[PDB]
Amino acid sequence: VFLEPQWYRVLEKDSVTLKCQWFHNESLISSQYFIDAATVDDSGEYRCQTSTLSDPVQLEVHIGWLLLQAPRWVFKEEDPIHLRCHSWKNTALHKVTYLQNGKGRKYFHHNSDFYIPKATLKDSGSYFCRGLVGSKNVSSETVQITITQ
Amino acid sequence: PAPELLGGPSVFLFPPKPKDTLMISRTPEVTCVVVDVSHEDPEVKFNWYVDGVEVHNAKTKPREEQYNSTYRVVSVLTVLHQDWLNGKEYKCKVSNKALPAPIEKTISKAKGQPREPQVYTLPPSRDELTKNQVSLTCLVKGFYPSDIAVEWESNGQPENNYKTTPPVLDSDGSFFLYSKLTVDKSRWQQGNVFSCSVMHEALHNHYTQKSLSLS
Amino acid sequence: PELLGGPSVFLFPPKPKDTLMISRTPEVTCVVVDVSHEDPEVKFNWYVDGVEVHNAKTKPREEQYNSTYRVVSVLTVLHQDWLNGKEYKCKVSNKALPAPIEKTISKAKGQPREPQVYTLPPSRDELTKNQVSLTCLVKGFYPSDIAVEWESNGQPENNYKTTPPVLDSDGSFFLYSKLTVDKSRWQQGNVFSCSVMHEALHNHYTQKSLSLS
Ligand SMILES: *[C@@H]1O[C@H](CO[C@@H]2O[C@@H](C)[C@@H](O)[C@@H](O)[C@@H]2O)[C@@H](O[C@@H]2O[C@H](CO)[C@@H](O[C@@H]3O[C@H](CO[C@H]4O[C@H](CO)[C@@H](O)[C@H](O)[C@@H]4O[C@@H]4O[C@H](CO)[C@@H](O[C@@H]5O[C@H](CO)[C@H](O)[C@H](O)[C@H]5O)[C@H](O)[C@H]4NC(C)=O)[C@@H](O)[C@H](O[C@H]4O[C@H](CO)[C@@H](O)[C@H](O)[C@@H]4O[C@@H]4O[C@H](CO)[C@@H](O)[C@H](O)[C@H]4NC(C)=O)[C@@H]3O)[C@H](O)[C@H]2NC(C)=O)[C@H](O)[C@H]1NC(C)=O
Ligand SMILES: *[C@@H]1O[C@H](CO[C@@H]2O[C@@H](C)[C@@H](O)[C@@H](O)[C@@H]2O)[C@@H](O[C@@H]2O[C@H](CO)[C@@H](O[C@@H]3O[C@H](CO[C@H]4O[C@H](CO)[C@@H](O)[C@H](O)[C@@H]4O[C@@H]4O[C@H](CO)[C@@H](O[C@@H]5O[C@H](CO)[C@H](O)[C@H](O)[C@H]5O)[C@H](O)[C@H]4NC(C)=O)[C@@H](O)[C@H](O[C@H]4O[C@H](CO)[C@@H](O)[C@H](O)[C@@H]4O[C@@H]4O[C@H](CO)[C@@H](O)[C@H](O)[C@H]4NC(C)=O)[C@@H]3O)[C@H](O)[C@H]2NC(C)=O)[C@H](O)[C@H]1NC(C)=O
Ligand SMILES: *[C@@H]1O[C@H](CO)[C@@H](O[C@@H]2O[C@H](CO)[C@@H](O[C@@H]3O[C@H](CO)[C@@H](O)[C@H](O)[C@@H]3O)[C@H](O)[C@H]2NC(C)=O)[C@H](O)[C@H]1NC(C)=O
Ligand SMILES: *[C@@H]1O[C@H](CO[C@@H]2O[C@@H](C)[C@@H](O)[C@@H](O)[C@@H]2O)[C@@H](O)[C@H](O)[C@H]1NC(C)=O
Ligand SMILES: [Cl-]
């Protein structure tokens, strides 16, 4: 039950690849999985078998220009927080800002991942990203990140 | 060449002309304009909504090749005079293959208490009367919203040699404007009565007229 | 073509009033936004008609609420240079720009034309109201750069608004400025003046009075 890439939140037309140690929404599949170009229906619960029966692994396919991706949303103090501002069809994104609690925290001329190497309590809040695709101003939905000790 | 269009189409949604909403004889329209439509994905699907309820009476215009190698694609929706002035919201939903989702745009009349225009005609300055042409002035103030139409007449016939300033926000949050009608001095000296016609929602019958002549 | 991300540059002219009154200093302002923390160094080269000039006063970079830097350079300008139509060029260099960004501005071109200025009292119908409108009509001017003001007993009047320039059918501009005053002051016979500053007036200045008669 491994995701390649690790992003569990993806965007329509993203390639996902799933690995084993299938049941799509507790139901049989076409082969014994490569998603070539996602849609909203590719969302939901996923499990695998050939060995035992795996845990549940959730995949959210979203619709939008931008999607703020993280490996998870709950982090220990001093853990590294890796945020990716993912654009639809990997469309070139420029003048990119990652916001926290409605304030610009980090700015990039060209789309770049915003890596925080050592999480602190101060890193909790709602995050989103925005940027320019050509001359269109676009933003992602917000996500909540919480930090514990 | 052809431009890159990384963000796909953009939408601009425009209101009816003020006079069109105020005269029952005329046909007010909301116009949904889509630009940066590529040659490869040139189809645009329009859905229209009035206060969230879908309507089906829009006119679909033929697409227009622009000089930058894009299409301009337009849908026009005729509205009801009362709905616009009562503040219904007009929603244009634009679908196109180059986008991740539909673009939605909404427009309505500006909100806030309507205020009646006060209308004042002002003769030419004594110093202008040495010229061959003179300026007749119409001041329209104290009005809200800014949507207003202004015209001139003399003796039942339109006078068109005029220019009107845009609306200007005054210190009390109302608007004012000025309209300047330029006439031949002979016509003013003869005693012809000129009139400044103003149309606005807060006027009785949406119409008032003030006149101006020599004394 | 079009360019990708990087700093952006905006170049602003002097205030019209500052270019016409010799007691004032006109400035040309080059603003650079979206400067990253990673490459915050910004160099300004300033050219007048082609000739590099130094003497531009560069403010130090300022942290914006969105986590970018903004840097302003201000070139003081000679009144007559701006009026004679000289081009002012701002060149901005920075490591994140592949090529430096250049911006040029100057006074609008075309044959200057003298405003005529006419003051107009309130309509008789407005004399019913608590306040009244004194109107200043300014027409025949070119270019649109202008400043208009109201005065009484050598002090500026507070409560006035001026329309933007509107293009007349002959290619010149007009506007109206409305001064609102309490009716008492008008009927007591106080004198009000519309002042107009434009490059095509003698001494870049004229004024016209208005009072009850
Ligand atoms: C490729 O080319 C195309 C076309 O190019 C053009 O042709 C070539 C040859 C060039 O010369 C070029 O200059 C020409 O434009 C490009 O298309 C243009 O794209 C830009 C954006 O990039 C558009 O810019 C917007 O303009 C809006 C105003 O547009 C009107 O006015 C202009 C003139 O100023 C006209 O040219 C337009 O066509 C619009 O005119 C109106 O059209 C209506 C419909 O026809 C008319 O209403 C109807 O009229 C009929 C009768 O005719 C009936 O009466 C109906 O009842 C009635 O409905 C209307 O009368 C008419 N008005 C006229 C003629 O005056 C701007 O509003 C808009 O600005 C907003 O958004 C900007 C974001 O880009 C932002 O920066 C601004 O701040 C502003 O933001 C808004 O601000 C207001 C308050 O001020 C707020 O309320 C808003 O909330 C706020 N935000 C918003 C809305 O998000 C744009 O500047 C331009 O319109 C468009 N041109 C055309 C012709 O469509 C294209 O970009 C090029 N692409 C590339 C990649 O190069
Ligand atoms: C991160 O933040 C910064 C700044 O943050 C800001 O503060 C926070 C809290 C927020 O509130 C945020 O919104 C604030 O901006 C962001 O920086 C902004 O970046 C945008 C671009 O993304 C800039 O937008 C341009 O603005 C121009 C207008 O700017 C003036 O007016 C606005 C208000 O409307 C002010 O806020 C500005 O500061 C500017 O104000 C002027 O400043 C002058 C210099 O100081 C003053 O002149 C001087 O005055 C003194 C007296 O004090 C002396 O007298 C001097 O002599 C005199 O020089 C002047 O008085 C003052 N005017 C005022 C207050 O009115 C727009 O012109 C510009 O539009 C053009 O370009 C667009 C392309 O982006 C295009 O779409 C438009 O259609 C238009 O097109 C051009 O038109 C011109 C002219 O007609 C033509 O030359 C060209 O043909 C044409 N195309 C071009 C050039 O391509 C933009 O809208 C914005 O200015 C800037 N703000 C600041 C403060 O710097 C930043 O974007 C954020 N980054 C991210 C990633 O989020
Ligand atoms: C597997 O189960 C998941 C989880 O329920 C399914 O995801 C859901 O898919 C539907 C339609 O594909 C989504 O509905 C759509 O979105 C909005 C909801 O606001 C609705 O208004 C639209 O009309 C549209 O029907 C739904 O949101 C989505 N839910 C989540 C949480 O992702 C998935 O489709 C299932 N897959 C299969 C193959 O059965
Ligand atoms: C983008 O715009 C921000 C806020 O504007 C709002 O969002 C965009 C998508 C437009 O639809 C606009 O009409 C909305 O009101 C600005 O504060 C910000 O500076 C811009 N962001 C960047 C990264 O340039
Ligand atoms: Cl400015």
| Domain carrying residue A92 | 65-149
Ligand number nearest CA of B7 is 1
Question: Number of C-alpha atoms within 13 angstroms, CB side, residue A55?
Answer: 4
Instruction: Looking at the structure, tell me whether residues A57 and A75 fall in a common domain.
Output: no
Residues B31 and B59: beta-carbon distance below 8 Å: no
How far is the C-alpha of A59 from the C-alpha of A23, rounded, in Å? 13
Residues C52 and C75: beta-carbon distance below 8 Å: no
- B145 to chain A, minimum CA–CA distance in Å? 30
How far is the C-alpha of C9 from the C-alpha of B91, rounded, in Å? 36
Backbone phi, then psi, for C82, in 5-degree steps?
-65, -45
3-state SS record for chain C: CCCCCCCEEEEECCCHHHHHCCCCCCEEEEEEEEECCCCCCCEEEEEECCEEECCCEECCCEECCCCCEEEEEEEECCHHHHHCCCCEEEEEECCCCCCCEEEEECCCCCCCECCEEEEECCCHHHHHCCEEEEEEEEEEEECCCCEEEEEECCEECCCEEECCCEECCCCCEEEEEEEEEEHHHHHCCCCEEEEEECCCCHHHCEEEEECCC
Q: Is C106 on the interface with B (CB under 8 A)?
A: no
Instruction: Looking at the structure, tell me whether residues A81 and A140 fall in a common domain.
Output: yes
Domain edge (last residue) among A20, A49, A64: A64
Q: Which residues of A touch B (CB under 8 A)?
A: 11-12, 63-65, 88, 91-92, 132-136, 138
The CA-based angle C11-C17-C21, given to 5 degrees, is 120
Q: Which residue's C-alpha comes closest to atom 96 of ligand 2? A: C10
Question: What order of strands is seen across the sheet that includes strand A66-69?
Answer: A66-69, A81-87, A114-116
β-partners of residue B53 are: B50
The structure was resolved experimentally with X-ray
Question: Number of C-alpha atoms within 13 angstroms, CB side, residue C159?
Answer: 9
A147: left (phi over 0), alpha (psi -120 to 50) or beta: beta
Residues B120 and B195: beta-carbon distance below 8 Å: no
Query: Residue A146: which CATH number?
Result: 2.60.40.10
> Chains near A, with 3+ CB pairs < 8 A?
B, C
- Residue of C65, C67, C95, C97 to mutate, testing the A interface (most A Cβ within 10 Å of its Cβ): C67
Instruction: Looking at the structure, tell me whether residues A75 and A40 fall in a common domain.
Output: no
Contact A107 C66 (CB under 8 A): yes
Nearest-CA residue of chain A relative to C4? A94
Instruction: Please choose, from the candidates C183, C170, C201, C71, the residue with its C-alpha nearest in 3D space to the C-alpha of residue C127.
Output: C183
Q: How many CB contacts within 8 angstroms connect chain B with chain C?
A: 73
Instruction: Looking at the structure, tell me whether residues A82 and A140 fall in a common domain.
Output: yes
Amino acid residing at B38: S
Q: Is A123 helix (H, G, I), strand (E, B) or coil?
A: helix
Q: Which residues of B138-172 are buried (b: 16+ CB within 10 A; e: fewer)?
A: bbbbbbbbbbbbbbbbbeeeebeebbbbebbebee
Contact A134 B101 (CB under 8 A): no
Instruction: Looking at the structure, tell me whether residues A72 and A125 fall in a common domain.
Output: yes
Q: What is the largest CA-CA distance in chain B?
A: 68
Cβ contacts of A84 within 8 Å, gap of 6 or more: A7, A68, A69, A70, A113, A114
Instruction: Looking at the structure, tell me whether residues A51 and A90 fall in a common domain.
Output: no
**What is chain C's Cα-based Rg?**
22
How far is the C-alpha of B105 from the C-alpha of B191, rounded, in Å? 52
Q: Which residue's C-alpha comes closest to atom 40 of ligand 2? A: C12
Residues B133 and C116: beta-carbon distance below 8 Å: no
Instruction: Looking at the structure, tell me whether residues A56 and A2 fall in a common domain.
Output: yes
How far is the C-alpha of C141 from the C-alpha of B182, rounded, in Å? 16
Instruction: Looking at the structure, tell me whether residues A123 and A73 fall in a common domain.
Output: yes
Instruction: Looking at the structure, tell me whether residues A50 and A121 fall in a common domain.
Output: no
Q: Is C1 on the interface with A (CB under 8 A)?
A: no
Contact B6 A134 (CB under 8 A): yes
How far is the C-alpha of B90 from the C-alpha of B140, rounded, in Å? 29
Asked whether the bond before B145 is cis by omega within 30 degrees of 0, the reply is: yes
Q: Ligand 2 centroid to B67 CA: how many Å?
A: 28
Burial class (CB in 10 A: 0-12, 13-18, 19+), A92: middle
How far is the C-alpha of A42 from the C-alpha of A81, rounded, in Å? 27
CA torsion through residues C15, C18, C24, C30, sign: positive
Cβ atoms within 10 Å, residue B112: 9
Q: Measured from the CB, is residue B20 less than 6 Å from ligand 1?
A: yes
How far is the C-alpha of B114 from the C-alpha of A72, rounded, in Å? 52
- C46 to chain B, minimum CA–CA distance in Å? 32
How far is the C-alpha of A108 from the C-alpha of C68, rounded, in Å? 9
Resolution stated for this PDB structure, in Å: 2.4
Tokens of B108: 């309505």
3-state SS record for chain B: CCCCCCCCCEEEEECCCHHHHHCCCCCCEEEEEEEEECCCCCCCEEEEEECCEEECCCEECCCEECCCCCEEEEEEEECCHHHHHHCCCEEEEEECCCCCCCEEEEECCCCCCCECCEEEEECCCHHHHHCCEEEEEEEEEEEECCCCEEEEEECCEEECCEEECCCEECCCCCEEEEEEEEEEHHHHHCCCCEEEEEECCCCHHHCEEEEECCC
Residues A133 and A91: beta-carbon distance below 8 Å: yes
Q: Ligand 3 centroid to A42 CA: how many Å?
A: 9
Structurally, chain A folds into a number of domains equal to 2
**What is chain A's Cα-based Rg?**
17
Residue B137's Cα: distance from chain center in Å? Answer: 21
Domain edge (last residue) among A45, A64, A83: A64
| Domains recognised in chain B with CATH numbers | 9-108 (no CATH), 109-214 (2.60.40.10)
How far is the C-alpha of A49 from the C-alpha of B51, rounded, in Å? 51
Instruction: Looking at the structure, tell me whether residues A35 and A2 fall in a common domain.
Output: yes
How far is the C-alpha of A73 from the C-alpha of A56, rounded, in Å? 17
Q: Are strands C8-12 and A125-133 parallel, antiparallel or unpaired?
A: unpaired
Q: Is B135 on the interface with C (CB under 8 A)?
A: yes
Instruction: Looking at the structure, tell me whether residues A79 and A145 fall in a common domain.
Output: yes
Tokens of B17: 């002309």
Q: Which residue's C-alpha comes closest to atom 7 of ligand 4? A: A137
Q: Are strands B59-60 and B71-78 parallel, antiparallel or unpaired?
A: antiparallel
Question: Number of C-alpha atoms within 13 angstroms, CB side, residue A76?
Answer: 2
Residue C48's Cα: distance from chain center in Å? Answer: 20
How far is the C-alpha of C171 from the C-alpha of B94, rounded, in Å? 40
Q: Which residues line ligand 3 (CB under 6 A)?
A: A 24-25, 40-41, 43-44, 60
Q: Is A112 helix (H, G, I), strand (E, B) or coil?
A: coil
Contact B100 A136 (CB under 8 A): no
Instruction: Looking at the structure, tell me whether residues A74 and A136 fall in a common domain.
Output: yes
Instruction: Please choose, from the candidates A111, A107, A105, the residue with its C-alpha nearest in 3D space to the C-alpha of residue A145.
Output: A105
